[PDB]
Every structure is written in structure tokens, then in C-alpha cells.
């Protein structure tokens, strides 16, 4: 019972949820859902997706 963090969106991953990705350089990615997952494969920067955790630190929202 460790809660993982989404590699794209910064959401909290509870057990069973989402997919884990192993990129070919063996860097482990973790998605909470298929919305994090598909926008990862689509080559989207999390800094430009307005609801992600990394956007809100970049835009100083909710400090």
C-alpha cells in the first residue's frame, strides 16, 4: 500500500489503477488513467496541459 504519483499529470495512483510504462531506456512511467496515458504517447508536455500538477507549479496556481 504505497500510493504512486502519475508521471504525466501528478495525480495519485492507488493500487490497481492505471498502467505502468517501461520506456526502452528503462525509465519507469506510471499513469493513473488512460487520459494521462494517451497524452503521454501523443507527445504532450505536461507543462502545457492546464490541469496537470506541473502546469500549476509553472503557473503558480494554488500556492
Amino acid at each position: 500500500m504505497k500510493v504512486e504519483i502519475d508521471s504525466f499529470s501528478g495525480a495519485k495512483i492507488y493500487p490497481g489503477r492505471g498502467t505502468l510504462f517501461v520506456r526502452g531506456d528503462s525509465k519507469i512511467f506510471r499513469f493513473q488513467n488512460s487520459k494521462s496515458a494517451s497524452l503521454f504517447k501523443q507527445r504532450k508536455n505536461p507543462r502545457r496541459i492546464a490541469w496537470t500538477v506541473l502546469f500549476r507549479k509553472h503557473h503558480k496556481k494554488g500556492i
Partner: protein
């Protein structure tokens, strides 16, 4: 599977049927592995035998060193790219399929594995664990 494997495996989703060409992840000279058959396969009418991570297959080489080509050799799948479920609920997958050339007992032909190895594969096959670096 069959003989050579140290331990048993939980059932992993079968990603790789016969005719699947997977990359070859060791330094034997083979560039890919074309699966002709899967060890331990159940006999069902019309069902292609389908390999999975940690399984031992029989394979040929379609690209690579000429002395490795035109022969049937055992191989062991180390990466899968079809999302399978672990017993702790983790669904995971690789970007590619990969396998290493083995003998019938499970000794490596190669000496080094380029990339990650599924932990189910490393636990089932001690020699693959010996030459693997990062394991998932």
C-alpha cells in the same frame, strides 16, 4: 517453460503468437527472433501458440549474423509490450518485445542483455538474471 525454468510462473497475458518477430536483446549477432513455436503450449484446435514474458520459445533468426540464420534455436522472452497484470494489481508493458537466444536448458548464448528484463523472466531463468542489468 518445460525444463530449465527454476520456479513456476503466474499466468501472464500471451502477447506473442507464432509468426511474431521480436527484437533480439543479447549480443549474439541476431537482430530479431521470429517465433515458430512456443514450449509448453496447450493443444487447442485453431489456436496459435502464443508466447509470453519468461516463456521459452523456438525461433529462427531473420536478420543478423549469417551463421545464426536459417536455424531453429531456443529463445526466452524478456520484454512483452502487451499489458499484463501482476498479482499486486500492476498492469505493465514494455515499448517492445524482446528475447534472448538460449540453449534447450536455459544457458545464454550471449553474455549481455541490452535493456530491461521482466522480473518474471529474471526469476524464472537464472542465467538471464545473471546477464541482466536493470530488471523492469
Amino acid at each position: 517453460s518445460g525444463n530449465g525454468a527454476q520456479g513456476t510462473k503466474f499466468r501472464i497475458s500471451l502477447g506473442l503468437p507464432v509468426g511474431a518477430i521480436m527484437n533480439c536483446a543479447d549480443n549474439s549477432g541476431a537482430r530479431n527472433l521470429y517465433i515458430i513455436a512456443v514450449k509448453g503450449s496447450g493443444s487447442r484446435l485453431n489456436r496459435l501458440p502464443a508466447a509470453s514474458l519468461g516463456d521459452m520459445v523456438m525461433a529462427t533468426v531473420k536478420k543478423g549474423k549469417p551463421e545464426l540464420r536459417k536455424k531453429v534455436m531456443p529463445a526466452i522472452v524478456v520484454r512483452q509490450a502487451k499489458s499484463w497484470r501482476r498479482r499486486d494489481g500492476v498492469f505493465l508493458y514494455f515499448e517492445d518485445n524482446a528475447g534472448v537466444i538460449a540453449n534447450p536448458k536455459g544457458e545464454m548464448k550471449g553474455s549481455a542483455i541490452t535493456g530491461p528484463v521482466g522480473k518474471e523472466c529474471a526469476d524464472l531463468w537464472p542465467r538471464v538474471a545473471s546477464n541482466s542489468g536493470v530488471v523492469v
